[PDB]
Protein backbone atom coordinates (compact mmCIF):
# COMPACT_ATOMS: atom_id res chain seq x y z
CA UNK A 1 0.00 0.00 0.00
CA UNK A 2 2.74 2.52 1.06
CA UNK A 3 4.48 2.58 -2.42
CA UNK A 4 3.13 2.55 -6.05
CA UNK A 5 -0.59 2.68 -5.01
CA UNK A 6 0.08 5.61 -2.54
CA UNK A 7 2.20 7.48 -5.20
CA UNK A 8 -1.14 7.75 -7.13
CA UNK A 9 -2.60 10.32 -4.64
CA UNK A 10 0.18 12.96 -5.27
CA UNK A 11 -2.08 15.54 -7.09
CA UNK A 12 -1.68 18.69 -4.85
CA UNK A 13 1.24 21.21 -4.59
CA UNK A 14 3.25 21.88 -1.37
CA UNK A 15 5.08 24.75 -3.23
CA UNK A 16 4.37 26.89 -6.36
CA UNK A 17 6.64 29.63 -7.93
CA UNK A 18 8.42 32.18 -5.63
CA UNK A 19 7.97 35.89 -6.62
CA UNK A 20 11.68 36.68 -5.81
CA UNK A 21 13.59 33.38 -6.54
CA UNK A 22 11.29 32.36 -9.48
CA UNK A 23 11.41 28.68 -8.50
CA UNK A 24 8.82 26.08 -7.32
CA UNK A 25 9.99 26.63 -3.67
CA UNK A 26 7.22 28.96 -2.22
CA UNK A 27 5.52 26.66 0.38
CA UNK A 28 1.88 27.89 -0.02
CA UNK A 29 0.65 26.99 3.56
CA UNK A 30 3.63 28.68 5.38
CA UNK A 31 3.56 31.30 2.52
CA UNK A 32 7.41 31.56 2.61
CA UNK A 33 9.99 30.47 -0.06
CA UNK A 34 12.24 27.52 1.00
CA UNK A 35 15.25 28.77 -1.14
CA UNK A 36 15.40 32.64 -0.91
CA UNK A 37 13.34 32.90 2.36
CA UNK A 38 10.82 35.35 0.68
CA UNK A 39 9.01 37.13 2.22
CA UNK A 40 12.05 38.33 4.26
CA UNK A 41 14.48 41.30 4.14
CA UNK A 42 17.40 38.78 3.95
CA UNK A 43 17.94 36.16 1.16
CA UNK A 44 18.35 32.68 2.78
CA UNK A 45 22.00 31.58 2.14
CA UNK A 46 24.08 29.47 4.61
CA UNK A 47 27.90 28.87 4.80
CA UNK A 48 27.25 25.06 5.05
CA UNK A 49 25.64 25.48 1.56
CA UNK A 50 28.87 26.02 -0.47
CA UNK A 51 27.33 24.97 -3.86
CA UNK A 52 23.89 26.55 -3.03
CA UNK A 53 25.55 29.98 -2.32
CA UNK A 54 27.54 29.70 -5.65
CA UNK A 55 24.28 28.97 -7.64
CA UNK A 56 22.68 32.35 -6.59
CA UNK A 57 25.80 34.58 -5.94
CA UNK A 58 26.63 37.78 -7.94
CA UNK A 59 27.51 37.11 -11.63
CA UNK A 60 25.01 34.21 -12.12
CA UNK A 61 22.52 36.77 -13.62
CA UNK A 62 22.87 39.83 -15.94
CA UNK A 63 24.40 42.33 -13.39
CA UNK A 64 22.39 45.05 -15.27
CA UNK A 65 23.99 47.91 -13.20
CA UNK A 66 27.14 46.39 -11.53
CA UNK A 67 28.53 45.35 -15.02
CA UNK A 68 29.65 48.93 -15.83
CA UNK A 69 30.62 50.17 -12.27
CA UNK A 70 34.24 49.02 -13.09
CA UNK A 71 34.30 51.19 -16.32
CA UNK A 72 32.71 54.23 -14.53
CA UNK A 73 35.37 53.99 -11.72
CA UNK A 74 38.31 53.49 -14.20
CA UNK A 75 37.29 56.82 -15.94
CA UNK A 76 36.86 58.60 -12.52
CA UNK A 77 33.00 58.94 -12.48
CA UNK A 78 33.41 61.57 -15.29
CA UNK A 79 30.33 63.57 -16.54
CA UNK A 80 29.57 65.51 -19.81
CA UNK A 81 31.23 64.63 -23.19
CA UNK A 82 34.31 65.19 -25.46
CA UNK A 83 33.66 67.42 -28.55
CA UNK A 84 36.32 66.91 -31.38
CA UNK A 85 39.96 67.42 -32.59
CA UNK B 1 60.93 42.01 -23.57
CA UNK B 2 62.04 44.70 -21.00
CA UNK B 3 58.59 46.44 -20.52
CA UNK B 4 56.75 44.33 -17.83
CA UNK B 5 53.17 45.40 -18.91
CA UNK B 6 53.57 43.22 -22.13
CA UNK B 7 53.16 39.38 -21.88
CA UNK B 8 55.34 36.64 -23.53
CA UNK B 9 52.54 34.08 -22.71
CA UNK B 10 51.59 31.80 -25.69
CA UNK B 11 48.07 31.16 -24.19
CA UNK B 12 47.26 34.92 -23.79
CA UNK B 13 48.72 35.84 -27.26
CA UNK B 14 46.67 33.04 -28.97
CA UNK B 15 43.39 34.19 -27.27
CA UNK B 16 44.15 37.96 -27.80
CA UNK B 17 44.51 37.25 -31.60
CA UNK B 18 41.46 34.87 -32.00
CA UNK B 19 39.04 37.06 -29.87
CA UNK B 20 40.41 40.34 -31.40
CA UNK B 21 37.33 42.40 -32.45
CA UNK B 22 36.80 43.76 -36.04
CA UNK B 23 38.68 47.12 -35.50
CA UNK B 24 41.97 45.35 -34.40
CA UNK B 25 41.59 42.53 -37.05
CA UNK B 26 41.97 45.48 -39.54
CA UNK B 27 45.57 45.88 -38.18
CA UNK B 28 46.23 42.05 -37.81
CA UNK B 29 45.29 41.53 -41.54
CA UNK B 30 48.10 43.80 -42.93
CA UNK B 31 49.98 43.29 -46.27
CA UNK B 32 53.47 44.50 -47.37
CA UNK B 33 53.83 46.91 -50.38
CA UNK B 34 55.47 46.24 -53.82
CA UNK B 35 59.12 47.31 -54.45
CA UNK B 36 57.64 50.04 -56.79
CA UNK B 37 54.96 51.27 -54.26
CA UNK B 38 57.58 51.23 -51.40
CA UNK B 39 59.94 53.34 -53.63
CA UNK B 40 56.96 55.75 -54.27
CA UNK B 41 55.54 56.24 -50.70
CA UNK B 42 58.48 54.97 -48.53
CA UNK B 43 56.23 52.81 -46.23
CA UNK B 44 56.75 49.04 -45.56
CA UNK B 45 53.21 47.56 -45.05
CA UNK B 46 49.57 48.79 -44.59
CA UNK B 47 46.25 47.34 -43.33
CA UNK B 48 44.39 45.83 -46.39
CA UNK B 49 41.10 47.71 -47.10
CA UNK B 50 38.46 46.62 -49.70
CA UNK B 51 39.42 47.74 -53.29
CA UNK B 52 43.30 47.54 -53.29
CA UNK B 53 44.92 45.55 -56.19
CA UNK B 54 47.55 42.97 -54.99
CA UNK B 55 49.84 40.10 -56.23
CA UNK B 56 49.97 36.54 -54.68
CA UNK B 57 53.59 35.67 -53.57
CA UNK B 58 53.14 32.22 -51.80
CA UNK B 59 50.84 29.16 -52.11
CA UNK B 60 49.47 27.23 -55.16
CA UNK B 61 47.91 30.56 -56.40
CA UNK B 62 51.42 32.24 -56.49
CA UNK B 63 51.86 34.70 -59.43
CA UNK B 64 48.13 35.64 -59.89
CA UNK B 65 46.95 39.24 -59.11
CA UNK B 66 43.93 41.63 -59.03
CA UNK B 67 41.59 43.77 -56.84
CA UNK B 68 40.53 42.34 -53.39
CA UNK B 69 36.71 41.69 -53.17
CA UNK B 70 35.99 40.83 -49.48
CA UNK B 71 38.26 41.64 -46.46
CA UNK B 72 36.67 38.66 -44.59
CA UNK B 73 37.86 39.85 -41.11
CA UNK B 74 35.75 37.15 -39.33
CA UNK B 75 37.75 34.33 -41.13
CA UNK B 76 41.17 36.21 -40.94
CA UNK B 77 41.22 36.18 -44.81
CA UNK B 78 40.92 38.52 -47.86
CA UNK B 79 39.12 37.10 -50.99
CA UNK B 80 40.69 38.47 -54.27
CA UNK B 81 38.85 38.86 -57.66
CA UNK B 82 39.85 36.41 -60.51
CA UNK B 83 41.51 34.08 -57.85
CA UNK B 84 38.60 31.56 -57.45
CA UNK B 85 38.06 27.73 -57.40
CA UNK B 86 35.31 26.34 -59.73
CA UNK B 87 33.47 23.50 -57.83
CA UNK B 88 32.58 20.14 -59.54
CA UNK B 89 29.01 21.53 -60.21
CA UNK B 90 30.46 24.50 -62.24
CA UNK B 91 29.74 27.29 -59.65
CA UNK B 92 32.81 29.47 -58.72
CA UNK B 93 33.75 30.28 -55.05
CA UNK B 94 36.48 32.79 -53.95
CA UNK B 95 39.66 31.27 -52.31
CA UNK B 96 40.56 32.60 -48.79
CA UNK B 97 44.02 34.36 -48.92
CA UNK B 98 45.96 35.74 -45.88
CA UNK B 99 47.01 39.37 -46.64
CA UNK B 100 50.68 38.97 -45.45
CA UNK B 101 51.28 36.34 -48.27
CA UNK B 102 50.05 39.02 -50.79
CA UNK B 103 51.80 42.31 -51.85
CA UNK B 104 49.97 45.70 -52.35
CA UNK B 105 50.78 46.51 -56.07
CA UNK B 106 48.21 49.42 -56.24
CA UNK B 107 46.76 51.62 -53.39
CA UNK B 108 43.05 52.63 -52.94
CA UNK B 109 43.53 56.35 -52.06
CA UNK B 110 40.91 58.24 -49.93
CA UNK B 111 41.39 61.16 -47.40
CA UNK B 112 41.86 58.73 -44.41
CA UNK B 113 44.56 56.71 -46.35
CA UNK B 114 46.44 59.94 -47.38
CA UNK B 115 46.22 60.85 -43.61
CA UNK B 116 47.54 57.32 -42.64
CA UNK B 117 50.41 57.59 -45.24
CA UNK B 118 51.46 61.16 -44.10
CA UNK B 119 51.29 59.96 -40.41
CA UNK B 120 53.72 57.00 -41.02
CA UNK B 121 55.83 59.44 -43.17
CA UNK B 122 55.06 59.02 -46.92
CA UNK B 123 56.53 61.64 -49.37
CA UNK B 124 53.29 62.07 -51.45
CA UNK B 125 49.43 61.83 -51.13
CA UNK C 1 -8.84 40.66 -35.92
CA UNK C 2 -5.99 42.91 -34.57
CA UNK C 3 -2.91 41.81 -32.50
CA UNK C 4 -3.19 44.15 -29.43
CA UNK C 5 -0.53 44.64 -26.66
CA UNK C 6 -0.80 43.10 -23.18
CA UNK C 7 -1.62 45.92 -20.63
CA UNK C 8 -4.28 47.33 -23.09
CA UNK C 9 -7.93 47.89 -21.90
CA UNK C 10 -10.91 46.94 -24.17
CA UNK C 11 -11.57 50.73 -23.71
CA UNK C 12 -8.02 51.47 -25.07
CA UNK C 13 -8.55 49.03 -28.06
CA UNK C 14 -11.92 50.75 -28.90
CA UNK C 15 -10.29 54.24 -28.53
CA UNK C 16 -7.13 53.19 -30.52
CA UNK C 17 -9.11 51.66 -33.48
CA UNK C 18 -11.44 54.76 -33.65
CA UNK C 19 -8.51 57.29 -33.52
CA UNK C 20 -6.25 55.42 -36.07
CA UNK C 21 -8.57 53.69 -38.62
CA UNK C 22 -11.48 56.29 -38.48
CA UNK C 23 -14.25 53.72 -37.62
CA UNK C 24 -16.99 53.39 -34.89
CA UNK C 25 -16.46 50.11 -32.89
CA UNK C 26 -19.73 48.26 -31.97
CA UNK C 27 -17.76 45.86 -29.67
CA UNK C 28 -14.28 44.42 -28.82
CA UNK C 29 -13.85 40.76 -27.65
CA UNK C 30 -10.24 39.99 -26.47
CA UNK C 31 -8.54 36.62 -25.74
CA UNK C 32 -4.81 36.05 -24.91
CA UNK C 33 -3.38 33.37 -27.28
CA UNK C 34 -1.42 30.25 -26.20
CA UNK C 35 1.47 32.16 -27.95
CA UNK C 36 1.30 34.58 -24.92
CA UNK C 37 0.22 37.59 -27.11
CA UNK C 38 -3.27 39.24 -26.98
CA UNK C 39 -5.68 39.41 -30.00
CA UNK C 40 -8.99 41.37 -30.22
CA UNK C 41 -12.12 40.88 -32.45
CA UNK C 42 -12.93 44.57 -33.26
CA UNK C 43 -16.56 44.46 -34.58
CA UNK C 44 -17.66 47.75 -36.28
CA UNK C 45 -21.19 49.32 -36.42
CA UNK C 46 -23.44 48.59 -39.49
CA UNK C 47 -22.19 51.91 -41.10
CA UNK C 48 -18.66 50.56 -42.01
CA UNK C 49 -18.11 47.30 -44.01
CA UNK C 50 -14.86 45.81 -42.52
CA UNK C 51 -13.52 44.92 -46.07
CA UNK C 52 -13.38 48.70 -46.97
CA UNK C 53 -11.01 49.29 -43.94
CA UNK C 54 -9.15 45.90 -44.40
CA UNK C 55 -8.24 47.00 -48.01
CA UNK C 56 -7.46 50.57 -46.68
CA UNK C 57 -4.83 49.00 -44.27
CA UNK C 58 -3.36 46.77 -47.07
CA UNK C 59 -3.86 43.08 -46.05
CA UNK C 60 -6.72 41.23 -47.92
Amino acid sequence: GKGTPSFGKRHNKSHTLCNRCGRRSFHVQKKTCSSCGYPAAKTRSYNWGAKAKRRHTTGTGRMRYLKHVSRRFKNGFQTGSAKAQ
Amino acid sequence: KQSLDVSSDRRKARKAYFTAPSSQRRVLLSAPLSKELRAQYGIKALPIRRDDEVLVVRGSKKGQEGKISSVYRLKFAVQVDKVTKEKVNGASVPINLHPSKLVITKLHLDKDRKALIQRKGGKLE
Amino acid sequence: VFQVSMKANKYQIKKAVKELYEVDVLKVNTLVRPNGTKKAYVRLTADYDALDIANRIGYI
Binding site: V69, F77, T79 | - | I57, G58, Y59
Partner: protein, 116 residues
Protein backbone atom coordinates in the same frame (compact mmCIF):
# COMPACT_ATOMS: atom_id res chain seq x y z
CA UNK D 1 17.79 55.92 -41.33
CA UNK D 2 17.72 59.57 -40.02
CA UNK D 3 20.84 61.38 -38.61
CA UNK D 4 20.54 62.76 -35.02
CA UNK D 5 22.83 65.82 -35.79
CA UNK D 6 20.02 67.07 -38.18
CA UNK D 7 17.26 66.48 -35.51
CA UNK D 8 19.00 68.68 -32.82
CA UNK D 9 18.28 71.75 -35.10
CA UNK D 10 14.41 71.37 -34.96
CA UNK D 11 11.48 72.64 -32.76
CA UNK D 12 9.61 70.49 -30.13
CA UNK D 13 6.56 69.99 -32.49
CA UNK D 14 8.64 69.22 -35.69
CA UNK D 15 10.17 66.21 -33.79
CA UNK D 16 6.68 65.13 -32.49
CA UNK D 17 5.33 65.34 -36.12
CA UNK D 18 8.40 63.37 -37.42
CA UNK D 19 7.90 60.70 -34.65
CA UNK D 20 4.14 60.11 -35.46
CA UNK D 21 5.05 59.86 -39.23
CA UNK D 22 7.81 57.26 -38.40
CA UNK D 23 5.33 55.35 -36.10
CA UNK D 24 2.76 55.26 -39.01
CA UNK D 25 5.64 54.27 -41.41
CA UNK D 26 6.50 51.29 -39.08
CA UNK D 27 2.73 50.45 -38.87
CA UNK D 28 2.33 50.24 -42.72
CA UNK D 29 5.71 48.34 -42.97
CA UNK D 30 4.50 45.85 -40.24
CA UNK D 31 1.40 45.37 -42.54
CA UNK D 32 3.61 44.68 -45.67
CA UNK D 33 5.78 42.14 -43.67
CA UNK D 34 2.66 39.84 -43.31
CA UNK D 35 2.58 39.22 -47.15
CA UNK D 36 6.34 39.68 -48.02
CA UNK D 37 8.82 36.77 -47.47
CA UNK D 38 11.59 38.86 -45.73
CA UNK D 39 11.16 42.66 -45.03
CA UNK D 40 14.39 43.90 -43.31
CA UNK D 41 13.67 47.65 -44.04
CA UNK D 42 11.51 47.88 -40.78
CA UNK D 43 14.83 47.90 -38.76
CA UNK D 44 15.89 51.38 -40.10
CA UNK D 45 12.37 52.78 -39.25
CA UNK D 46 12.29 51.45 -35.60
CA UNK D 47 15.95 52.65 -35.11
CA UNK D 48 14.86 56.07 -36.56
CA UNK D 49 11.98 56.17 -33.95
CA UNK D 50 14.57 55.47 -31.16
CA UNK D 51 16.89 58.20 -32.67
CA UNK D 52 14.01 60.81 -32.57
CA UNK D 53 12.71 59.71 -29.08
CA UNK D 54 16.32 59.98 -27.69
CA UNK D 55 16.67 63.52 -29.25
CA UNK D 56 13.24 64.56 -27.73
CA UNK D 57 14.21 63.13 -24.27
CA UNK D 58 17.70 64.83 -24.53
CA UNK D 59 16.08 68.26 -25.40
CA UNK D 60 13.37 68.20 -22.63
CA UNK D 61 16.15 67.09 -20.17
CA UNK D 62 18.35 70.09 -21.29
CA UNK D 63 15.34 72.50 -20.81
CA UNK D 64 14.74 71.11 -17.23
CA UNK D 65 18.51 71.42 -16.38
CA UNK D 66 18.27 75.11 -17.52
CA UNK D 67 15.10 75.85 -15.40
CA UNK D 68 16.73 74.21 -12.25
CA UNK D 69 20.20 75.82 -12.94
CA UNK D 70 21.75 77.76 -9.99
CA UNK D 71 19.81 76.20 -7.02
CA UNK D 72 20.00 73.49 -4.32
CA UNK D 73 17.48 70.58 -4.61
CA UNK D 74 17.76 69.36 -8.23
CA UNK D 75 15.72 66.27 -9.29
CA UNK D 76 17.58 63.10 -8.09
CA UNK D 77 17.77 61.77 -11.74
CA UNK D 78 19.57 65.07 -12.78
CA UNK D 79 21.98 64.83 -9.75
CA UNK D 80 25.38 63.15 -10.55
CA UNK D 81 25.07 59.45 -9.52
CA UNK D 82 28.76 58.40 -8.97
CA UNK D 83 27.98 55.89 -6.09
CA UNK D 84 25.74 55.78 -2.92
CA UNK D 85 28.96 55.68 -0.78
CA UNK D 86 30.57 58.64 -2.72
CA UNK D 87 27.35 60.79 -2.31
CA UNK D 88 27.21 59.97 1.48
CA UNK D 89 30.98 60.76 1.81
CA UNK D 90 32.07 64.18 3.22
CA UNK D 91 32.50 66.92 0.52
CA UNK D 92 35.76 68.97 -0.08
CA UNK D 93 34.55 71.79 2.30
CA UNK D 94 33.66 69.07 4.88
CA UNK D 95 36.69 66.73 5.57
CA UNK D 96 38.84 69.96 5.16
CA UNK D 97 37.23 72.30 7.82
CA UNK D 98 39.67 72.58 10.82
CA UNK D 99 39.28 74.22 14.31
CA UNK D 100 40.65 77.78 14.95
CA UNK D 101 43.25 76.31 17.43
CA UNK D 102 44.52 73.57 14.98
CA UNK D 103 44.63 76.26 12.19
CA UNK D 104 46.85 78.51 14.44
CA UNK D 105 49.24 75.53 15.12
CA UNK D 106 49.75 74.79 11.34
CA UNK D 107 50.35 78.57 10.62
CA UNK D 108 52.90 78.62 13.54
CA UNK D 109 54.71 75.22 13.07
CA UNK D 110 54.24 73.78 9.54
CA UNK D 111 56.47 70.79 8.53
CA UNK D 112 59.51 72.52 6.88
CA UNK D 113 62.06 71.43 4.19
CA UNK D 114 65.75 70.98 5.30
CA UNK D 115 68.95 69.40 3.81
CA UNK D 116 71.90 67.08 4.81
Amino acid sequence: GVKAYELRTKSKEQLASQLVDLKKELAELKVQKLSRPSLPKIKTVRKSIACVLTVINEQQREAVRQLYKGKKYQPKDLRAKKTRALRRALTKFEASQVTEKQRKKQIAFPQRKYAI
